[PDB]
Design a protein around this ligand. Structure first.
Ligand SMILES: *CC(=O)NCc1ccc2[nH]ncc2c1
Length: 339
């Protein structure tokens, strides 16, 4: 069995010459030489079988990524596991190797307006497909946007994804949430379970802002601090947007705050393209019902050099305990077995 940094990374003999890349949720990520296809690949080790929630997210992603096929969405090329349920402890998911990700790139690189435009186009093109399948990604962030050496972009990590359920979106004030804080839409903290497509467009807005300055736009340090970062820039919500929040704890929290002025986008981002900032404003709209949808975002003047709905494909159809979840992970990975 191959090893890397003390741990077993047991993918051979097909995959050899391992090098460490980084960490997934349930294990290590390495690159390896694929001896059949004669290219280096990425492989992530998943050890999920002790926990309901680890199993849930592992299985959700596998089911989604096997059903999806899109240029801007990472695929699964192979899955490695032991031949029987009794012997299966780890699962390895093999995927196309990508040089970097947007989190790593933003730490080190100034992006040209032309790169910002191209990255944003590819994110939304991928998101059009995901949303067309009635699926919500629910954890869009720079580290979930893979880039190769020619700046092709692929969305990854479908562990938090859900089928959209707008009729069951409503909840109370300060309801706990799982997805990454800095990219959470204001409504998560107020009255939303994150079951509508508008959740993903807010995160894309945050990513666009972050591409403009290399700094997260709303770097909250804790649950409600995230909301006050957002209101600090957007300003106090209007009467009409406040009246949309029927829940009294949420509404009265907002009414309790002093007046805050909107900070103009062109003052936060003085070197940004004015069309980029018009689109940014529409993605970072407080009221999720007024927020731009993915297909409108693609049609925005900022992206007119790339926009081509005939080349922005949609999905063929809508998408629909731990002993049982291990069995389901086993069955779902059967197609990659010798046999
Ligand atoms: C978002 C995610 O899954 N990150 C881990 C990862 C997947 C695929 C991949 N290909 N090259 C590097 C990679 C990292």
């Amino acid at each position: 069995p191959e090893m890397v940094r003390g741990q077993v990374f047991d993918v051979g003999p097909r995959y050899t010459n391992l090098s460490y890349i980084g960490e997934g949720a349930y294990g290590m990520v390495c690159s390896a030489y694929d001896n059949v296809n004669k290219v280096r690949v990425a492989i992530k080790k998943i050890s999920p079988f002790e926990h309901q929630t680890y199993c849930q997210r592992t299985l959700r992603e596998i089911k989604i990524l096997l059903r999806f096929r899109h240029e801007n969405i990472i695929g699964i090329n192979d899955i490695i596991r032991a031949p029987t349920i009794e012997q299966m402890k780890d699962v390895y998911i093999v995927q196309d190797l990508m040089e970097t990700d947007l989190y790593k790139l933003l730490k080190t690189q100034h992006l040209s307006n032309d790169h910002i435009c191209y990255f944003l186009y590819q994110i939304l093109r991928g998101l059009k497909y995901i949303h067309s399948a009635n699926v919500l990604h629910r954890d869009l962030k720079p580290s979930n946007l893979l880039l190769n050496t020619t700046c092709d972009l692929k969305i990854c990590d479908f562990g938090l994804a859900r089928v959209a359920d707008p009729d069951h979106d409503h909840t109370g004030f300060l309801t706990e949430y799982v997805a990454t804080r800095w990219y959470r839409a204001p409504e998560i903290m107020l009255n939303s379970k994150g079951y509508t497509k508008s959740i993903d467009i807010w995160s894309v807005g945050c990513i666009l802002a972050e591409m403009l300055s290399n700094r997260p736009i709303f770097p909250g340090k804790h649950y409600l601090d995230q909301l006050n970062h957002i209101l600090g820039i957007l300003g106090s919500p209007s009467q009409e947007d406040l009246n949309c929040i029927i829940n009294l704890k949420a509404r009265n929290y907002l009414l309790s705050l002093p007046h805050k002025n909107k900070v103009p986008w062109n003052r936060l981002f003085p070197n940004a393209d004015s069309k980029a900032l018009d689109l940014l404003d529409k993605m970072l709209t407080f009221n999720p019902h007024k927020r731009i949808e993915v297909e409108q975002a693609l049609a925005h003047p900022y992206l007119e050099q790339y926009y081509d709905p005939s080349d922005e494909p949609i999905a063929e159809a809508p998408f629909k305990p731990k002993e049982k979840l291990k069995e389901l992970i086993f069955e779902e990975t059967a197609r990659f077995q010798p046999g």
